[model samples]
Target: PSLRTQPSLYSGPFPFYRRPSELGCFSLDAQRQYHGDARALRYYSPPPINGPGPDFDLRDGYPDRYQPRDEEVQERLDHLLRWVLEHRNQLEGGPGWLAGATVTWRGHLTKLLTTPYERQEGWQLAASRFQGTLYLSEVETPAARAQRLARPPLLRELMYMGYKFEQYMCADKPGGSPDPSGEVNTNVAYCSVLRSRLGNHPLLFSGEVDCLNPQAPCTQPPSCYVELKTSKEMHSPGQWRSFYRHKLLKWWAQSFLPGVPHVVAGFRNPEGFVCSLKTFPTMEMFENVRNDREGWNPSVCMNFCAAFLSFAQSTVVQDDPRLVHLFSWEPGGPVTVSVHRDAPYAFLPSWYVETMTQ
Candidate 1:
């Protein structure tokens, strides 16, 4: 049986998603080594005010100062699993909370939230039930793999340009200015572990946070967090409309899931230099598209996600580590599931299982 994707079928009121609270955080260094602390976390440091606005050159270093992470290594849920195992005894929500929760990456949940409106990309989520908890891990689709392998030079540079923009906006420590001369290392990341609920489903997920705002009024973990984005400078209403319809939807899904308040976007020009900056409050992102008939609806996105969680919970009834219920979905099709055992599909590491069993 397959689950439907029709927006009309999921036009129900917004589902209840408990406010996501940060559980703990971990970092991955430039060499991709796991650290159980916030060593890789950067501070938010926007360009100086009252000055000629930022004239950032996103193309300065390029291949010379770029240290991209190796894509061949399939990390799956290893880093998050490590954090969970180390903090198992301290996690909130009573004794059986972990067992009853759905464990996955926030990126996976973001995909589900936007699935109803997604037209260009498809995804595969391998799920397993271990100790009463449902674990979801994304498997790269064949088409996506092909596209990445054959990615154009310009597109690769554009990706680098995004990182360069981040480098220009973040500083190594609070009360300091950004140092854009440093290398752009993609392997380095600071991930936030968060706990939330979608309707009846409890979720434990982790996402890579870009940086923190020490001066933010709240100064809380996620509340002070900021997301950095880069987009082509728009000069027309048509371009802005398209951006609101497409890009804002993605940004909203990504930040809203983890309770991040704002996304600061830099508008880059033809010469690969950022000329302007705009901040999009996550809660207010939908207002731009609320009246447009062709725009996405938060209600539809949330409803479909809740339905998917319900479907997965009911379908993955057997509590076994080795068994997998592979859910696959593509644009214009319903989500379908197939069963698998051991080997390629199972994602839970034996070390985690053995340690938990003890």
Candidate 2:
């Protein structure tokens, strides 16, 4: 691979996103019996409610008599289309706001913008830990890399993410102004810092997966998962394209694919930091830890790299009238992907980029 000292364009410290709630399901403390405490969960539950957007009429098309006239209706449609496109990189706040959502393969997402009146009702952003992000940065010196390598890999990864919990400016900006105060809720019930803070993900989605175990009494899980992203656009909105949907399951399938994996995960970062992400602890990280020994695979340190394809909803070029069909198809080749290491698209592998860029 090629290494350029110049830093990647957007190494962000932006706020992570979650969809909004009408019933405030996010604020509710689910009851649990397994792990002690009044209620709450060990990890987040199933997926989240879809984030917010413009309300649609019961009929598919615009309301007939109530609809704006030809030119007028077109103008309104144009404006909404333009607004959605223009701010396609931010999070979708409470009502018709936008949150930055991107298309990546790290998580297997099943986001579908179907008939709103049909099965659709709402959306929400998932917290960070339950959901994760990989990133890369310029440390300026090898010493920085050495110092970072000395830390826990997860926290080490966080340092370069451009934003840390402490640095997360939770004031009035755009997206629901953020309210990290919610952490208190999770803390009182679960004793989990992760659940307290970036743990507020989407749950109880309309048609999301139900990981509930039938053998046991049905109870809610702790949190849901989500992938939040940010870009250069001014307004900011969340989006999911069809190409990405296919890519997600595709990447997961390749995680264990037998190949050189030129499309490595955590593939991008300045330099030495990049190198550390690759150094396995002898075997699978998870297995190694479980056995209380070093060098684990299947039994130890796990491989966390893969490919990805990137697309900002607003930035993609398409006709407005058919905007709803955005995720309709995957893009052409030369697709961008995340590799295991650390790059904005680090969670994705490089072949993803190769396919798109080629």
Candidate 3:
């Protein structure tokens, strides 16, 4: 009935992510797979570990080194996943960016916190964000600088979430802001929720918002407010009822409300984005949605794949994990990310980033 053969090439048919226990029930690999222990699994992207001008992933995303199915990053990813999965039973949450790794975010935070290691997981998304933050310190305030410096190798998963959420605000047209309240379909309260999760950090003014703009569509809606999602639900839809009931429903509802943003990721690319700057919800909404999807981009997928498969004999076809849009060719030479939050938004790997530049 369909034309595409590759699981990566599907233009139609909804995808899913089943729990590890449900592996044998499904027939297709198209469903998303989840990590056995989603607890330690945290989100990451490019690093600010480098000082100014295109971070580490950007280096890898370039054409000179990047390929659709990049071997280098995956090799390291294999090693990292090996370390992560094999030792997962040993990991415990304590402080800072200990979201996934047993120790800390040695990948990128090597700079701000400056330990012996000076790498940021090279091209992978999981290790990329800390490096981007280290690289993009120019616009960040002193408080941000200190907090970054305070944590040595570990990246602050909660803080990274805030910055990642702010990524959606970088549109050429700045009029269309997202709703700022916690009632809308996608208020994705990165700011508020992180505050709740990570608590009120004096340094965390980044998530604070005074008011929603007048143009926000949800401002006039009956149930208009932000929709807060836990990293748990966003990463695995089947894990929670709220994630499946509300946020995921919005994903399906997007077909009818075509006005909502639609993102398409390319194969081997870090992220796929739908660029729009004029809609109303607030900058926060635009910022979070894009970054949220970016968190689910290529790098995240590979991390999921490796980590998940590490525990089992073979990957089941029935997993319903979030899927990325596959592309035959690179989108371009440079990543035109929608973030004044920049450091490149929603990117999974640098292959796409490097491919954009000459």
Candidate 4:
């Protein structure tokens, strides 16, 4: 059996998505070492509005000053699973809440939300039902791995520039100014663990947050979270329209999942410097596509996500941690599933399973 991908088929009233609440947070150090604290969190510090707009040099530190995380190592759900095990007693949703929730990374859910409109990329999700909770992990598709291995020098630099932009716009402490003199370390990250529900399915997911807006009117987490993004400067109506149709959809889906309210974007020029900045409110992002027939609809995205959740819930009926139901999908194709056991497919670590058993 397979699940359809047509947007029109799933278009309907927006599915009921409970407001996401941050349960807790964790951090990854410069060495990619996991810590159950917010030590890596940065504060939002945008450039002065009155002066000449930011002339941020995103390429200041390339290969020499960059400490990129090894893509070959698959961390899976280890960090988030560690947090859950450590805080099992305090997780808000009652004793059995976790067992009934869908556990995964926010990035996995983002793929599901955009599947209806995605035309070029496909995805694979490895799922295992451990003690009644369905755990989902991403397996890089062959095409993706090939692309990563063959990624051009320019594309690699582009990825580095994205993180460099974050370093330029964030400060280590509240009320501090951005210091772009340090190395661009991709391993260091602050991930927020959140709880929410989509329709009837409960969700427990974590996402890497960019920075905290200490100056926002509401300083409460999730609300005060600001997502930083860098894009090529737009100079024409066609360019802007394409941005709204494609880029905004991705930005909206990413920030909206964790209840993040704002996305601060830095538009970089060809010289690898940010020349302008803009903030896109998550709630208002859809307004740009409301009238355009070619644009993606929020309802269609959410509805399809809900439908997929239902499909997975029904399909992965076994509750064995050793078994996996690999759900795979590609552009223009329906989501299909295959079964696997042990080794490569099984993601729920024995450590987590053994600890939880007792």
lDDT of each: 0.95, 0.21, 0.22, 0.95
lDDT of 3 at 32: 21
Question: Against the true structure, what is each candidate's TM-score?
Answer: 0.99, 0.19, 0.17, 0.99
Q: Between candidates 1 and 3, which one is better according to TM-score? A: 1
lDDT of candidate 2 over 1-358, digit per residue (tens): 2111111222223223222221111111322112322232122111123643212111211122121112211111122122223333442344322222222111122221111111212211111110122111111133434553476764433332312121122222222233323222111122211111111222211111111122223232312211111111122222223212232223322221111011112222332121111212211323322432221122000111111112322223332211221111121212122222232212223332233234
Q: Write the per-residue lDDT of candidate 1 for residues 1-358, one digit (tens) a residue.
A: 8999989999888999999999999999989999999999999998889778999999989999999999989999999999999999999999999999999999999999999999999999999998898999999999999999999999999999999999999999997889888999999999999999999999999999999999899998899999999999999999999999999999999999999999999999999999999999999999999999999999999999999999999999998989999999999999999999999989999999999889
lDDT of 4 by residue, 210-279 (tens): 9999999998889999999999999999999999999999999999999999999999999999999999
lDDT of 3 at 164: 30
Q: Summing lDDT over every window of 10 consecutive residues in candidate 3, give the lowest-scoring window.
A: 19-28
Number of the candidate with higher lDDT, 1 or 2: 1
* Model 2 ranges off by over 4 Å: 1-92, 98-207, 211-310, 317-333, 336-358
Better of 2 and 3 by lDDT: 3
Model with the higher lDDT, candidate 1 or 3: 1
For model 4, give the 10-residue run with minimal summed lDDT.
Answer: 45-54
**Model 3: lDDT to the true structure:** 0.22
